[PDB]
């Protein structure tokens, strides 16, 4: 009968990619994020928007300051040494898989930094562009980031899927497999 | 290689037993290094690495700033909790339990992550030979897990969304 | 439509 929870406001600005990101986390899940370019709040579940509001330009303003701060930290640090923490990738199905019964594949990229990856879905060794979903860079307990990639599919014994993730810390693109 | 530069900041609101005990932990990062901290339990900024010392000294000299921050335990943290207590905190999603051949207990599509799964063979909890995948977060506010028993037979699932325990049994 | 509160970023400098 003890309600124990955590709310995180996570925001960053990245170079040389010149992009920033702003989001709220509740007990390990995304509540929302703000599209900095488009300036709109994006609720993780559509149903959330019926209960809460977030003024979008608030997030824009912060990122601007975070942008500026980045310059200050750069000039401050004598040597900025490039270092990478390589991701660990996991593929699995959202639900128990039944043949002919629509489902979702989840590509769980975890424990990595910087927040930049190339992720590719592969049906039978060929890239897939239809039915793919992505999540902003999510926060952790540590300094590392977390990410989800989703793929909708119809199960059959003929198809096999792969999720291929590339990150500046990997020697070779990591490819994680899944079949029936 | 490829040089990169990150200015990362996480403001954590910690709730132990609702809004009774609450602490704020603001953490500033530079690339891979946590450099600055604001711990509401300390009430001042503290440098984690030398890189954060200037910010710490700068901001700690601002009383009205620190005064505002310590108050953010109420003005921001508890403020938001009041809102989230209406839909996020009480959010309940009933699990879907499935059994298939080692015997697998597939508990899928549930929220929150508070879940207990036991294996009963002939009515006693087989507290040995249990292989679990652990809790798995789908990232869409739904969880899943596989609890397995290595014997050559019914599993029970208890959850906050269930008034009465869920049971499944195999022939 | 209750409006969530947030932390405001402070410029670093001197």
């Amino acid at each position: 009968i003890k309600e124990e929870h955590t709310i995180i406001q996570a925001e960053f600005y990245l170079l040389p990619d010149k992009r920033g990101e702003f989001m709220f986390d509740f007990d390990g899940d995304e509540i929302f994020h703000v599209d900095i370019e488009k300036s709109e709040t994006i609720w993780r579940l559509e149903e959330f928007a019926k209960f809460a509001s977030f003024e979008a330009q608030g997030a824009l303003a912060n990122i601007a300051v975070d942008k500026a701060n980045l310059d200050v930290m750069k000039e401050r640090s004598n040597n900025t040494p490039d270092a990478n923490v390589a991701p660990e990738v996991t593929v699995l199905s959202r639900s128990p898989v039944n043949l002919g019964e629509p489902n979702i594949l989840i590509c769980f990229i975890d424990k990595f930094s910087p927040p930049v990856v190339n992720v590719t879905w592969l049906r039978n060794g060929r890239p897939v562009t239809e039915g793919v979903s992505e999540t902003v860079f999510l926060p952790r307990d540590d300094h590392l980031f977390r990410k989800f990639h989703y793929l909708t599919f119809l199960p059959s014994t003929d198809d096999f899927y792969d999720c291929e993730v590339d990150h500046w810390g990997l020697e070779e693109p990591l490819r994680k497999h899944w079949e029936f | 290689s490829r040089p990169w530069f990150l200015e990362y900041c996480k403001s954590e609101c910690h709730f132990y037993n609702g809004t009774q005990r609450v602490r704020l932990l603001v953490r500033y990062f530079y690339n891979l290094e946590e450099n600055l901290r604001f711990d509401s339990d300390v009430g001042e900024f503290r440098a984690v690495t030398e890189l954060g010392r200037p910010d710490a000294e700068n901001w700690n000299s601002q009383p009205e700033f620190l005064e505002q921050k310590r108050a953010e335990v109420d003005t921001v943290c508890r403020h938001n909790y009041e809102i989230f207590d209406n839909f996020l905190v009480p959010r309940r999603v009933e699990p879907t339990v499935t059994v298939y051949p080692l015997l697998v207990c597939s508990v899928s599509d549930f929220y929150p992550g508070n879940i207990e799964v036991r294996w009963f063979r002939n009515g006693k909890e087989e507290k040995t030979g249990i292989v679990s995948t652990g809790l798995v977060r789908n990232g869409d506010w739904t969880f899943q897990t596989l609890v397995m028993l290595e014997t050559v037979y019914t599993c029970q699932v208890e959850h906050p969304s269930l008034t009465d325990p869920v049971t499944v049994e195999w022939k | 439509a209750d409006g969530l509160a947030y932390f405001r970023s402070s410029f670093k400098g001197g």
Partner: T-cell receptor
């Protein structure tokens, strides 16, 4: 119309009496500020409150973040206390400072 | 200087269509500057704010009708390009230290009157 409810509008105090001003907020404020504008004088900064109370000479200020109000108390009213009193606070859910409607205080000798 | 904000001139009268430039010296060491326009009903109208030389925010009117800059080691300025009767008001300058704060400290303000 988009300001803070500040009461009373106007106030007359006999020299040596006291009264209180009060701002009512429509949401959680991050902190409150109080000003006095003299006679042909500048805006004088009186208090900055983020929480609790602060007392400065004959002035005491209080801010309750939850109950969404702030009060300014004048005791032992003096001639120089005459003027217009403003409150100003910014919401925790926005970026913008909003002001009170103002209180004109006249102190009778 | 400080802790004081110096606004000049105390008063200013201009003819309709003339320019009205007013100046403000923020507190020593204060990077944050705001311009407010107060009317007869004690309402505070936001015009524009600066962080040093950079403009963080301003309204449509200040963008189209006003020109303001806060030059390094120089008095901040707000100038009306073509004054009209509607611009008669008290213009307030307030300086802060930390952009994520209140604790404004206001100047004496410039009283502007525009006449035909």
């Amino acid at each position: 119309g988009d300001q803070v409810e500040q009461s009373p509008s106007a106030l007359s105090l006999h020299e040596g009496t006291g009264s209180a001003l009060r701002c009512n907020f429509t949401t959680t404020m991050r902190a409150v500020q109080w000003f006095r504008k003299n006679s042909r004088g500048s805006l004088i900064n009186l208090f900055y409150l983020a929480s609790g109370t602060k007392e400065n000479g004959r002035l005491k200020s209080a801010f309750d973040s939850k109950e969404r109000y702030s009060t300014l108390h004048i005791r032992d009213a003096q001639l120089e206390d005459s003027g217009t009193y403003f409150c100003a606070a910014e919401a925790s859910n926005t970026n913008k400072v909003v002001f009170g409607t103002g209180t004109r205080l006249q102190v009778l000798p | 200087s400080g802790g004081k904000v110096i606004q000049t001139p105390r008063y200013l009268v201009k003819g309709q269509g003339q320019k009205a430039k007013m100046r403000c010296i923020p507190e020593k060491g204060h990077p944050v500057v705001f311009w407010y326009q107060q009317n007869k009903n004690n309402e505070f109208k936001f015009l524009i704010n600066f962080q040093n030389q950079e403009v963080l925010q301003q309204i449509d009117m200040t963008e189209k009708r006003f020109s303001a800059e806060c030059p390094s080691n120089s008095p901040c300025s707000l100038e009306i390009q073509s004054s009209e009767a509607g611009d008669s008001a008290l213009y307030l300058c307030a300086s802060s230290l930390n952009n994520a704060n209140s604790d404004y400290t206001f100047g004496s303000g410039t009283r502007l009157l525009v006449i035909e």
